[PDB]
Amino acid sequence: MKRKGIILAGGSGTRLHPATLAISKQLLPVYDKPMIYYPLSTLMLAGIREILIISTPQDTPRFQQLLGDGSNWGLDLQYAVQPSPDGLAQAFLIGESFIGNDLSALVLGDNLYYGHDFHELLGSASQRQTGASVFAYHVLDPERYGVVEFDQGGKAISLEEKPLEPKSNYAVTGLYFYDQQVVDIARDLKPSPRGELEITDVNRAYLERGQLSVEIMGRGYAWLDTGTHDSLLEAGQFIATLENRQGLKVACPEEIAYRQKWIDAAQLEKLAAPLAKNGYGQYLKRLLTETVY
Amino acid sequence: MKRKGIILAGGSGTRLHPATLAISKQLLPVYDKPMIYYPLSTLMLAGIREILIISTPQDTPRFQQLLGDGSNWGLDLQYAVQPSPDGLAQAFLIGESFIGNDLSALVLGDNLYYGHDFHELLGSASQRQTGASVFAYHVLDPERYGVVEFDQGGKAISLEEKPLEPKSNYAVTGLYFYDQQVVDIARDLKPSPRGELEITDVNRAYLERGQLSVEIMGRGYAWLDTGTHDSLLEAGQFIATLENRQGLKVACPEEIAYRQKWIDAAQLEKLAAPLAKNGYGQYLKRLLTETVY
Amino acid sequence: KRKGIILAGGSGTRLHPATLAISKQLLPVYDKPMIYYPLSTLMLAGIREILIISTPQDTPRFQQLLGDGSNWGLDLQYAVQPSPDGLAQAFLIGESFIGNDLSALVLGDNLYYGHDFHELLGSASQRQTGASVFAYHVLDPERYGVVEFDQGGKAISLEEKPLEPKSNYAVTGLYFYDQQVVDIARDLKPSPRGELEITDVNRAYLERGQLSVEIMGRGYAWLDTGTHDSLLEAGQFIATLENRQGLKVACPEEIAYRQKWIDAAQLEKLAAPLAKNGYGQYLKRLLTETVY
Amino acid sequence: MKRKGIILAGGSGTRLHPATLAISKQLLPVYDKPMIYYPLSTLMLAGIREILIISTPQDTPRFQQLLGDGSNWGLDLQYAVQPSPDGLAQAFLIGESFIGNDLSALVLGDNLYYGHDFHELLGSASQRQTGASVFAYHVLDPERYGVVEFDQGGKAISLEEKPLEPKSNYAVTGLYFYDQQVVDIARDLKPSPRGELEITDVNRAYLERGQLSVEIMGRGYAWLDTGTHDSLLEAGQFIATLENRQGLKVACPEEIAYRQKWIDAAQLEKLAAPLAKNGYGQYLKRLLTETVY
Ligand SMILES: CN(C(=O)c1ccccc1)c1c(N)n(Cc2ccccc2)c(=O)[nH]c1=O
Ligand SMILES: CN(C(=O)c1ccccc1)c1c(N)n(Cc2ccccc2)c(=O)[nH]c1=O
Ligand SMILES: CN(C(=O)c1ccccc1)c1c(N)n(Cc2ccccc2)c(=O)[nH]c1=O
Ligand SMILES: CN(C(=O)c1ccccc1)c1c(N)n(Cc2ccccc2)c(=O)[nH]c1=O
């Protein structure tokens, strides 16, 4: 089957003002590359090439200008806007026509993932053509997230969005895989107390059909978010330490495309020319002559 | 005599791409506030209220939307563009009519200053009705900056822009105070071997007339630039550590305007309401009822 | 003349297991042992005669690291605090070290940075009467001695770790005292938590109208190293300054040289054994470079 | 059938003086725990319980006070001294009697590792009953390390210690596994030009026999090292960001013993007791009542 991608870069509102007055959070860099490269790279690693970027009226054109139609990176990028931040689950109504009768994956524009065998973690979720797949990650502050409770057998048995009394420390990450049933589930949602269409409700519909796979994203993986000024800074230092230690970049879309055989040497060479005088173009150039396992 | 301020927020070119592809360096935040807030606050602490922000064709309108006419902070802000990055001293040609017959001060849009008695450090440059004043600061890498040589008695005796063999470790910082001669010195300037109208040629012109005052910005002050992704990050951590230690912000313009008796408590409360839900608005609110010495 | 005391006590078990193998104040902040910072602070206050007080197990190690201090133009002595019975116990333990002189006490994990710091210390240190402390605006005053001011800015109360703090002004870990302090310490009774409190010593001066409270402004950095998190921030803060400037913060050898307590020959010989690393190279650079 | 471990916690000479004038590098903390906890945890994760710790004359006794005989953690620890820093390969001479007739592993006392499936990465190598196993990791500065060269088929064809002209960017990490041949190979080593018994000469002897296995430690793992004050600080920040995000600790030996079933609940409870009023003891207590996947 075919699986298409959606990145939701919703508005942070005025939460991070005045820092984000001139530029929305999702267009900020994390260290050396725009924030959106990280979730984009995650979809690419999941085998996904057709991707819809949804954001605000104001930012959607800015992403188009940054990313184009993606043909440079062997992708097919399209855009849509969410006129008002009416909940993450609205992504599937906005993208109904984009999705068609195909499988889909949703990732939030401000989630970074790092770790080993990430291709294989995602592959098993991409492989499932029936039901939904999500990931649970042990966090210190589960109250801020969708929370998954497990029984002593290891079976997911409940989900709650931002519970006052969380039942575990397992938060659901901002990467979701879905089958063809997601649009209709999305269409029947009602607004929560806060007036949002909630992705946790989508996820609960599958759980209540026994069609939700909840895989553990283990403690050896880094799932970071960019919610506060503080965490933005930590995420930047984290990526800076890996990259400077390794001489290898995290979530460089041009590299991922090249390693997936979606662009060839000659194309990557052309992508490197414009930035040949900075570290990034110099890095793309080096990938043409080095074996990296 | 009245002193007017100029902030040159010129381009970074393609130097920091792809990170700055969607947003220009000087519109990024440093931790919790826009970069430009820091040099703006520096001019405000120096007593300056009439300020011209010069940036690229693309960014000047964005600074204009972020900052407006300045009347909300008791400032008077105007705008002009630098069509091409033909050197820093071009700020005086672009700003000729804005400066008029008055004294002036230039600050770079990407310089952050911190330390004690900063009001007094600037005041003694601001008080000088004739001549020019600049600040020298000990750095690791003087070859990147304008460099000031001193003789055994502490007298400034030479300036070189980015010398290959620096004569000292003292860099001239991106904050400059000038009398009414500056525009005429700037109009006589011809381009250097790197094709720029050099602020260091302006400073040398004052030096060769015996009218340059070089004051030491002591090691107890922090002068950070934001030249690389690495230093941007260090800058962020540095401000974060001060702010979270003290519960006081560095370079909050609303606060400086309020402490300078330029806006009143009413106006401050009115600036605080729209941000009432985030830390920044709350901070502005707290300043209303706490005495800080 | 003023005598100096560095209280490098226990952090108890609260930074365990990181401090299982080492006293907190022997850990480094970036490139140098933590105690170099308060030591440098007392030196900057013009104090050369310094008593270092620590645990029985730690005191020999400070002694190994620092010696008699004569290499840096200082006069260092050592004494032990057998149980962590409170900060104000430094004066009882140090009674005979102090004698009839004026004194100062700095906490071994307090780090300070900023401009004119010599002058901020000079005013307190030159006083020949009463006591002097510094008040610093912090986010978390509950963790500290908290000074309350009236509308004229006069200090009117002090409280140790108040549950409901009267201000955001913490009293920093640097204290200057006239000859009254030892006798005030002697008459103290243990607090609820069973500690001889420095805040009780400072309240005794305040009640006599003999406490001077100066503001350490927001342009100074008073870091402390109370948690693993803050220790790390302190490390990052020092590193950023030093790598920016090419100058070191709280380098006692530098401070001794600049104070004229050791000469260029002496400094050169201190550089020799460290000449293969950045620290010794730094000292050798100081011989030839004028730094304003 | 036993694999025995060695942690070489040598002298960093005077390289990090004066910070290490009072204590050995490997007794410093990386964030919340002593540095040696990290490689210790690494040998524990590889299934190794009998471990010799080698440090200097001055430091060995201090490791003894910190760690004891290891019985509180289900381990069996011994201590020996390296009187002169005459090479890593010396660990096998000093450790000859400790190893006896068993298989062995050597880890450097300042090496930190983090990543997913690390148990499995270590498992394959520790399970081998022949030859030697080492890990190759892409770094920015291969000159500082042993460097492995591969042919176009990925086969290792040469090993060089600190080459002036590195043949690849793949460094051999400070984690080595050996069959019963290493002791005899070590004992026939002669000093290299810098007067050192080289672990790289040991690994080369196995390579020339066709008995060296080089596994790649992929980029999704973090091999941090702690060579400079700068890197030590970065390592601290890295651990801190992981631990505060997750509410789980990296390289907590008590946790590893418990999960390996080498100590029981009651024993973990007793270990928690004296640390109950810091975050580390509370964390041991929470591990009694939480299921962590
Ligand atoms: C280590 N890693 C990641 O954790 C990752 C992060 C975001 C998205 C995808 C991978 C990663 C990574 N594994 N790779 C290798 C790779 C990428 C694509 C196909 C085959 C190998 C890469 O080129 N860049 C990376 O950042
Ligand atoms: C400590 N400090 C500064 O270093 C500073 C930095 C840039 C611009 C202005 C001040 C600072 C500062 N000194 N003040 C106090 C202040 C501001 C204006 C008048 C009188 C006092 C402030 O309100 N905010 C600050 O950030
Ligand atoms: C900038 N500064 C300090 O903030 C400081 C901090 C702790 C202790 C002493 C000084 C400092 C400093 N001002 N000096 C200069 C100095 C040192 C001694 C006498 C006069 C000036 C120095 O040599 N090292 C320093 O770290
Ligand atoms: C994620 N991880 C590591 O990367 C690791 C790092 C150094 C040493 C051992 C493990 C790790 C880890 N996988 N575990 C789980 C574990 C520990 C022991 C046996 C089986 C699983 C753990 O308890 N702590 C950890 O830090």
Ligand SMILES: [Cl-]
């Ligand atoms: Cl894992």
Ligand SMILES: [Cl-]
């Ligand atoms: Cl200074």
Ligand SMILES: [Cl-]
């Ligand atoms: Cl101040």
Ligand SMILES: [Cl-]
């Ligand atoms: Cl990997």
